[PDB]
């Protein structure tokens, strides 16, 4: 869904594409303007998190669908935080879609195509070269990001159902929030109707993706998308 | 593979059957004497662990295939400890069968038929009513059991590849080792040849199960099985 283009030893161009993919790449479509929306929303979320003292890779914008970001030594992880039961959590817990969790759940996934991103725990992570201290710091950050995003979104009639983060290490060996934060990588539900305003619209044919992503953008910024 | 028969409020009969099952119950056979072997080996392992200060449910033997055990409030968990890469670990880590782990891996599985025993982490466990303190105590015990069994077995030319444990709570709220410890619930490899002396013989048609289980029994006790 994104192009990464080097600049020097220090930074990268992160370009968001109009392509959407689901079910291990077996479902595909293109949505004009999706790249733009995902980029803008990432910018907005990264700026919010920075103000709250979250170290992120965001440096700046490079016009349109492109962000300027700090190059990191990436952890091969996808870190999922979950507030409300949806998606794959229904295969691990005998709870219905929409069940409100008594506290957030953090799941670790091994980012590995050959193995299709299997869930892992702290012991697997250690065998992968990720110390317990590092894992603990990663989850601590993910849970803080959760709090800030859910609070900020709740005040806008949006429930943060779950979401995925990625992380890397900077030259100082600090753990820095990376990749993207968009309706591609989060579940957003309208607080009243409880309907999806995210990639689930594309996954399960729930309506128009662009319209749902625009709606998210409008309800967050108070403005209509210019493209 | 086992019958559980109540006695009073305090204890249960644990009866080991000759039935073997694999691949979510899609492969089945009966092996005369398997019940006997599994019972005896469980007794031997529970006695070893008790001597080492592991609290287990073992009370006594009730002749033949039947053990007397303390009734516990069971945790709905299967706790897997792994020393050498085998089985499902090959789908989570890009490592070959027989790879020696730099340290043991503990995996938690939600004992749930509808969901087919999915792997879980500490956060899922908490939603299931299992506190972090409880999980930490459970893994602490599993890792101690690992050390004792692998040491004791290594001195007998047997590598403990991985194994599954189960636990419950007694009336004092102590965490007590439960269920069974047998060639059904462990991977045992001959140290020299590295061949399976466990249920994998039945899983992948590697030879005779009874002969492999007898071999385990003989190499552990120094005596031939009487039945
Ligand atoms: N700051 C960063 N430095 C280096 N790599 C990054 C950074 N942020 C994200 N990445 C990586 O760049 C890629 C972004 O493109 P994406 O479409 O997400 O690829 P993928 O299909 O591998 O997830 C991902 O592999 C992601 O982990
Ligand atoms: N001390 C104990 N008290 C109560 N239940 C136990 C104890 N030890 C084992 N169990 C449970 O009894 C059953 C033993 O029979 P088993 O064939 O293992 O059944 P299952 O197919 O459910 O694993 C299991 O459900 C196990 O969790
Ligand atoms: N490879 C992945 C997997 C999940 N996710 C996101 O992480 C959250 C958890 O998704 P999930 O575990 O239910 O997986 P799916 O339902 O997406 O298959 C969802 O918001 C997904 O959008 C992601 O961005 N990338
Ligand atoms: N339901 C289960 C699952 C695994 N196990 C044991 O736990 C260890 C880990 O097995 P595994 O995770 O590779 O699963 P399988 O290879 O048995 O499918 C093996 O020694 C199994 O014999 C068990 O006793 N009961
Ligand atoms: Mg990605
Ligand atoms: Mg059992």
UniProtKB/Swiss-Prot annotation, chains A, B:
Domain of life: Archaea
One Pfam family this sequence matches: SAICAR_synt
Pathway involvement of the protein, from the record: Purine metabolism; IMP biosynthesis via de novo pathway; 5-amino-1-(5-phospho-D-ribosyl)imidazole-4-carboxamide from 5-amino-1-(5-phospho-D-ribosyl)imidazole-4-carboxylate: step 1/2
Keywords: ATP-binding, Ligase, Nucleotide-binding, Purine biosynthesis
SUPFAM superfamilies, per the entry: SAICAR synthase-like (SSF56104)
GO molecular function: ATP binding; phosphoribosylaminoimidazolesuccinocarboxamide synthase activity
InterPro entries: SAICAR_synt/ADE2_N, SAICAR_synt_PurC, SAICAR_synth, SAICAR_synthetase, SAICAR_synthetase_CS
One of the GO BP terms on file: 'de novo' IMP biosynthetic process
Enzyme class name: ligase
Similarity remark: Belongs to the SAICAR synthetase family.
Protein name, as recorded: Phosphoribosylaminoimidazole-succinocarboxamide synthase
Species whose genome carries this gene: Pyrococcus horikoshii (strain ATCC 700860 / DSM 12428 / JCM 9974 / NBRC 100139 / OT-3)
């Amino acid at each position: 869904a994104k192009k990464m283009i080097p600049i020097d030893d220090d930074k990268l161009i992160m370009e968001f594409k109009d392509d959407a993919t689901a079910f291990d790449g077996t479902k595909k479509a293109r949505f004009k303007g999706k790249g733009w929306l995902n980029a803008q929303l990432s910018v907005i979320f990264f700026k919010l998190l920075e103000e709250h003292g979250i170290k992120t890779h965001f440096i700046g914008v490079a016009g349109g669908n492109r962000l300027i970001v700090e190059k990191l030594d990436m952890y091969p992880l996808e870190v999922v935080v979950r507030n409300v039961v949806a998606g794959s959590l229904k295969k691990r817990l005998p709870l219905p879609e929409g069940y409100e969790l008594p506290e957030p759940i953090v799941e670790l996934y091994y980012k590995n195509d050959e193995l299709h991103d299997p869930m892992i725990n702290y012991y697997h992570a250690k065998v992968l070269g990720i110390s317990l201290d590092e894992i603990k710091k990663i989850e601590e950050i993910a849970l803080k990001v959760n709090e800030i995003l859910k609070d900020y979104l709740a005040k806008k009639g949006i429930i943060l159902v779950d979401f995925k983060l990625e992380f890397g290490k900077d030259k100082n060996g600090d753990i820095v929030l990376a990749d993207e934060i968009s309706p591609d990588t989060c579940r957003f539900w309208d607080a009243k109707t409880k309907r999806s305003l995210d990639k689930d619209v594309f996954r399960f044919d729930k309506g128009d993706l662009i319209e749902a992503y625009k709606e998210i953008y409008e309800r967050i910024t108070g403005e209509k998308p210019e493209f």
